Amino acid sequence: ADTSVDLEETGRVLSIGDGIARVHGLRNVQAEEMVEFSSGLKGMSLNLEPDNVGVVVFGNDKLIKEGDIVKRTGAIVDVPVGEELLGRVVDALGNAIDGKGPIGSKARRRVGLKAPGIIPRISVREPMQTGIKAVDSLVPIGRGQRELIIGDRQTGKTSIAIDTIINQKRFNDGTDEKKKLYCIYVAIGQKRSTVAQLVKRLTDADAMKYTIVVSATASDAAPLQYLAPYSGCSMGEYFRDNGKHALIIYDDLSKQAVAYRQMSLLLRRPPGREAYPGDVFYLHSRLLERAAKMNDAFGGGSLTALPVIETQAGDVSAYIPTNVISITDGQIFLETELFYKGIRPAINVGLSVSRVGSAAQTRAMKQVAGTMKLELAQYREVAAFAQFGSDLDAATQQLLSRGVRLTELLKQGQYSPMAIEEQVAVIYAGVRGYLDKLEPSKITKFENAFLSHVISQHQALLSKIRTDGKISEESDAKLKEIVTNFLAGFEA
Amino acid sequence: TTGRIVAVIGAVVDVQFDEGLPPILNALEVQGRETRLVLEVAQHLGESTVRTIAMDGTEGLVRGQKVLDSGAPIRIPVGPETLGRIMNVIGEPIDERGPIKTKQFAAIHAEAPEFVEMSVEQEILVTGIKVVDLLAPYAKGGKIGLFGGAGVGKTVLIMELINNVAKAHGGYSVFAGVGERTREGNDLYHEMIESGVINLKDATSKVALVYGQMNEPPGARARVALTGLTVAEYFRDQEGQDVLLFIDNIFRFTQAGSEVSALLGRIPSAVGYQPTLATDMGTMQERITTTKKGSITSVQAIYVPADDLTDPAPATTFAHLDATTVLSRAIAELGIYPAVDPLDSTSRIMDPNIVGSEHYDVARGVQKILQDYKSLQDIIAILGMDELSEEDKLTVSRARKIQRFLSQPFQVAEVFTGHLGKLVPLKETIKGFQQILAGEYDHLPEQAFYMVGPIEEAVAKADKLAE
Amino acid sequence: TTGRIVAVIGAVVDVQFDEGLPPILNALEVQGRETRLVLEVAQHLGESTVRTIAMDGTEGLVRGQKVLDSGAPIRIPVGPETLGRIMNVIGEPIDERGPIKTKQFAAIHAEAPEFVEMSVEQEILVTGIKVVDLLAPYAKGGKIGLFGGAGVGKTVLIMELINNVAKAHGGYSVFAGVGERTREGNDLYHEMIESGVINLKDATSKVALVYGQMNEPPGARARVALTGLTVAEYFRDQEGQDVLLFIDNIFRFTQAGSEVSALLGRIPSAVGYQPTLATDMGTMQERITTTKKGSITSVQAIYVPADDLTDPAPATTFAHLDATTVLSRAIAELGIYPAVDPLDSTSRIMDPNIVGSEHYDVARGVQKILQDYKSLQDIIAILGMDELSEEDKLTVSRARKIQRFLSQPFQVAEVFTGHLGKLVPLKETIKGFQQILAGEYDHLPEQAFYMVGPIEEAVAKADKLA
């Protein structure tokens, strides 16, 4: 009485094609449980139908044939979680892909867990410094916040994310454990050589130590690409639920949607708007709701997400683009026009927002950039309204004079994340009018000179602004003094 | 009755009953679960099998699992002991403060008030917001709609109205969060408390809350509005009070339905929507209403997919409103908040017979000039401004200043504008515009009119700018 | 194993087996035919039936016909004896020169190199083409893509590159003609013979040719890329060789996929394409890559349908390249060749730390002025230049001179330009563009810059224009 293959805990493949197995049997499987194929290939139980189980396959279905035995696992899909993963490159299921040995994982976590409710969280209040003036000054990001990076191909979306990961050494190399931020970088649909390029740079910046990289690339099965985000999320909640701080980049959520769309159509689920499943909003809401700030009652830890979405022809009104803009706590919109024009980052002031506002900003920063955002918005308008110097008054000549100078200061190169006090020093100079008489073309050069001066000579003012976290009345006076005088010697 | 689960595909679960088939709308409870899972019966497939929508996650369900017919549609705790509390789609407290000990329970599904139950009183409801008041006045007991694409101001606008109106309101308020951001229900709850609208120690709570956010399965999202609305109907009928209903965002109810629609076996209507969109919206919107028994003042946020106001959903909702505030990313983009579109916002009380001719002539006066300027915009763009008649370059002037005088620093967006929130009284509004239109400020600079409350601040700001 | 043909629809042949069902991807040989007809298994429909894709026309097949499991996937002759030979999807010679006598055979379906196998060295590959070199430089062992609507310059650009790069390359080359014109295969083969890269006398050929053109049934077009690809993989890993891989056109592989997809019975995705579009591009594109074992510099022409770059096919291809050359009908129609869109082409090497800041600053300099000209164009369009600012008119002058200086005569296009092909050295490009930017030629006329190599020739042309 060989009773190893009863149809309650095992089944047999009725048919297989395009990564979808229609398994017979599996009478006791649970929706969303993981199953195993004779070939050591894992799959996931998505459709539990009267006469069959629709199984999505986490790998090449070429090794699966009609008749194969499929075995339950009794477990709803999960993955390795914890500090062991830092500095490692894993696939969408947790397996290492840096051929640097097994992960020493002691904890596991379901990839699909609902986000903490109302009661367990507290308003986002601690800054999450990117290192990018434009961002940290105009569209501030706090911990527990979800801020979207969106724009066409090549407008610089990933860069924002890398600079951010790199900027975190400051605190991670420090003492304070509350200021530390562990990062997670999920590649989806991307190309292996690009990721390999990516993890190299991170290594060269001495950032891998605090980063985990979940990779679900271009040739990985649709279901791996699909899962990848939830997988990476779960690794971030480990830190979030243990009073630690995590930052996750979903690069990008566009390719995942495609994966979802594919997986979903191959299951024969009727296509919806634009060919995607009627629940693509849900696909991303469920995920991004998980980035959150827990109250002290739950460890005070947090998860901050920076999902990426690719627009086409800079059209942000597009259905997917708006679907995701309506989930996150703001967006950073990058335009190719601005980029080519010299404005890098190509952040579009007017169209980007932060729903957290200044609550995610240090007082030093709030002090200097409190009204700048709506000022630049109003500047872009009149700058357009006078692309014909229409008998323009002074209030608007002053508006155009600040607008241009401030625009130059928000410019920034790559890989050189600035420290908060450094940002405050340079914005200060502009916002206060000390630069209204310098020539726009000069501004970039001046900022390198000025910053040099204060960093070298004046670290007492930098350390105080940084420390007090505010701009006291004397600091504000020591600063006025430095800028005006250096400026003069500078314009000799 | 006891049925078994025969198929699970997402939020849709098919159940087979041996004897006694639960009627459509009935709620069934799945046996064997750490948490309460309710399934609403959606259809009778035949063969004593019903197709249902899950009110929560379907993970771990098994074919063959047991399901008991509860014998009635989802019923929730309704009454005064709901005030100051936070409820679920299915009526469970989610605030960790214990049971909700109501005398009665109500089914979230119910018929809308009959035609002979309608009321036609029309009283302006002043809000303190220049634009709304001036051009698209809200009406007490009326149906109000805030239309807007992602991130243009729907919620903040709902936030400042709670402050400028809900806060003084002598009556209850019900705020139903439908498919919106969890972070947001936590911001509001704690704000209600810090301002005593919610009292955790006594019975002075003047607001009940119901939530079915974006982290929920379609099913929950297709019903929270019902739960929310049901709580509100109680205070309207059984107590006869003046209710204030806030829903953010009702589009989510309709997106919820479109998300399971295909699994319900339906040919899609246009734009992907389900073929029953309008009727689904109708039987709901028709309950959100003032009657002779009580009064409801509903403020509903309405999402606009792809920013397209013609999208079957936003498009289908206009007919259910008495006043509409249409927000626009093109306005917002310029830094003009609130980003209301002055030429696409309307109110059923913008009638000389109701607000008066001074109110009316100003409003229309402001709209003509903004329209007049809209038309010229594209043209002076290319052909420039020299050739324009001094008569026409004055309307460009006044328009650009009005465009600004219409912005205002909200008290709930100081974190955004870096400006103290201003609330302007209806007469300060009418007058301010009357004067701009009258040529009484053609000397001050436009910028003086941007982000200010009353016209006097525009005059003061001119000086401050004077240098 | 012997199965029987149960159904036939175009290129989708369903075969039933009684004992021993072949795994997916296995090649079956249909029995009773004048020529070879290979069927590639695609899926197990259950009931001991397999749905397959024919590799040649299916006319004549009959239900109940016998089919034999080959026991493996399409396998093809791989090694140096393929050099100088023309071969089929299924690896048979089609150059009427006998059998390709190789030691080994490789199967066209392989997995992509692993993460740990990846490389990250970034070396610039100079081509002698001004626009490419200056603005979206290619890279050794990198992945290049030339996007182009019908008749814009994709093939001419591949030819010129074959000339300028392949010709003096130490190492092998593989040209894979996918879904294109047969005459072109013929034009190339004979040309290759002539310049001696193909030698029918000695073993000195440096090129292997694989073709599955516009006349083949969908399945052939759907697999030849894999076939050219495999040939290239052999030189890379089995000989640690530096390869060059040219494909015209990789869009055809995806199109082929869309042709059979309904037949495989799949609900279509957007624009009628197959729901498996991205993964199909993916497991294929991911083998076209440099690794620690060998280098593959690959240039792929990407046909853009109806000129729509938002088309699922081209749209999904951007993510696989390191450098892209987007060709434009609008530019072509102005007479600028190559019709490269300067504000739409990019290259992951356009980094100061790789091309040097001199290069990086001229490059961004040129784009900024063309971007600026681009915004003035709307107004220039109704009202011309009159109303323009003296300053604005100088950007316009410079932009129109930079735009013309980006064009250049290709040897390969001499019959059409009426001019002798030019190859400009990088430093000559960086320079010539500096000066233009710098106002050192604001006196010359635009026409002086049109169709020339080095700037020095632009000055001359100006004298001749007098």
Side-chain angles (χ1 to χ4, degrees), chain A residues 275-462 464-483:
Chain A
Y276 295 93
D279 69 340
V280 235
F281 166 68
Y282 186 39
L283 164 90
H284 294 156
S285 61
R286 218 160 61 182
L287 174 85
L288 301 166
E289 270 269 297
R290 284 156 67 173
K293 169 63 197 286
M294 317 292 291
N295 65 26
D296 288 319
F298 300 71
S302 83
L303 182 51
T304 305
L306 288 190
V308 186
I309 282 289
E310 164 168 82
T311 49
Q312 313 259 345
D315 176 40
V316 273
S317 317
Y319 170 65
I320 267 78
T322 48
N323 271 4
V324 197
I325 287 186
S326 74
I327 286 160
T328 67
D329 309 304
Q331 338 64 67
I332 299 171
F333 174 61
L334 304 173
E335 274 170 323
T336 73
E337 173 195 354
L338 295 168
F339 189 105
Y340 283 115
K341 257 157 173 168
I343 305 302
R344 308 202 207 60
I347 294 154
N348 173 325
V349 167
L351 297 177
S352 308
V353 293
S354 152
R355 313 198 205 211
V356 162
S358 52
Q361 271 176 327
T362 79
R363 273 106 181 177
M365 182 72 84
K366 189 195 308 157
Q367 282 180 254
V368 304
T371 65
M372 197 175 161
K373 198 174 187 286
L374 298 178
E375 191 162 310
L376 280 162
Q378 279 293 293
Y379 152 60
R380 292 152 201 293
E381 197 293 68
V382 262
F385 188 65
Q387 304 155 288
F388 37 134
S390 316
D391 63 73
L392 312 154
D393 63 271
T396 88
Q397 211 157 78
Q398 222 296 310
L399 184 39
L400 297 157
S401 293
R402 260 304 155 66
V404 195
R405 315 282 180 296
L406 277 177
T407 282
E408 294 294 295
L409 282 158
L410 298 183
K411 278 193 206 176
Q412 226 184 287
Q414 277 204 288
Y415 313 113
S416 298
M418 306 176 58
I420 202 69
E421 66 277 351
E422 265 134 60
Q423 313 195 25
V424 188
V426 334
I427 317 291
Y428 176 84
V431 161
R432 293 313 193 69
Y434 308 123
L435 309 181
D436 292 0
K437 272 186 287 164
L438 180 70
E439 209 199 356
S441 34
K442 297 300 234 156
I443 308 197
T444 279
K445 213 188 82 202
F446 166 77
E447 178 204 314
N448 289 281
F450 178 70
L451 225 30
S452 286
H453 179 49
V454 315
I455 287 169
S456 128
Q457 274 214 239
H458 306 71
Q459 10 190 1
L461 216 194
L462 293 186
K464 224 207 297 172
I465 280 168
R466 179 185 70 237
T467 277
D468 287 18
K470 195 218 197 80
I471 298 170
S472 42
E473 314 83 81
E474 188 175 87
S475 271
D476 182 74
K478 187 50 147 288
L479 264 175
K480 173 177 149 130
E481 218 200 17
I482 302 144
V483 342

Side-chain angles (χ1 to χ4, degrees), chain A residues 9-161:
Chain A
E9 303 290 299
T10 74
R12 281 176 185 159
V13 174
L14 296 174
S15 59
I16 170 59
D18 298 332
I20 301 294
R22 291 285 178 184
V23 191
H24 171 88
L26 285 188
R27 267 315 160 130
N28 301 323
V29 259
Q30 325 184 283
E32 280 174 72
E33 179 187 323
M34 193 153 292
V35 302
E36 315 180 293
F37 282 97
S38 342
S39 37
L41 224 46
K42 272 155 210 321
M44 174 190 198
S45 236
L46 259 9
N47 277 40
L48 313 169
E49 278 154 44
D51 69 301
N52 68 89
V53 185
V55 175
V56 150
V57 181
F58 294 127
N60 191 323
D61 59 283
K62 79 192 206 188
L63 309 152
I64 296 144
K65 330 193 312 151
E66 166 188 350
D68 284 19
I69 250 80
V70 193
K71 294 182 172 156
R72 308 183 40 182
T73 274
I76 306 279
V77 183
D78 56 16
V79 282
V81 127
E83 252 136 327
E84 295 79 279
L85 297 139
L86 311 165
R88 301 226 56 202
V89 190
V90 292
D91 71 3
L93 291 163
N95 304 304
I97 68 186
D98 49 8
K100 261 171 167 149
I103 318 284
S105 281
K106 312 169 89 206
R108 285 178 81 75
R109 188 92 190 283
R110 272 186 171 168
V111 292
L113 294 157
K114 208 163 156 161
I118 285 180
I119 290 305
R121 335 170 162 215
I122 177 68
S123 291
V124 169
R125 303 138 164 177
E126 330 165 45
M128 196 308 299
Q129 318 284 348
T130 58
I132 317 176
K133 313 174 234 167
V135 161
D136 293 342
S137 50
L138 303 161
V139 286
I141 307 155
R143 299 178 174 218
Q145 201 177 329
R146 292 128 329 139
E147 169 99 329
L148 182 82
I149 302 171
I150 179 175
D152 302 300
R153 52 180 139 93
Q154 292 292 303
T155 42
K157 303 159 255 139
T158 296
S159 307
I160 301 292

Side-chain angles (χ1 to χ4, degrees), chain A residues 16 18 153 191-192 197 262, chain C residues 44 113 266 322 344 348:
Chain A
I16 170 59
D18 298 332
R153 52 180 139 93
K191 200 182 69 177
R192 260 183 212 139
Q197 299 297 330
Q262 163 174 337
Chain C
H44 294 177
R266 307 166 148 163
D322 292 310
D344 206 1
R348 293 171 78 251

Side-chain angles (χ1 to χ4, degrees), chain B residues 153-168:
Chain B
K154 305 182 275 313
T155 303
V156 165
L157 186 74
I158 230 162
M159 284 322 173
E160 181 99 346
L161 284 149
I162 278 166
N163 186 72
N164 305 4
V165 176
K167 285 189 182 153

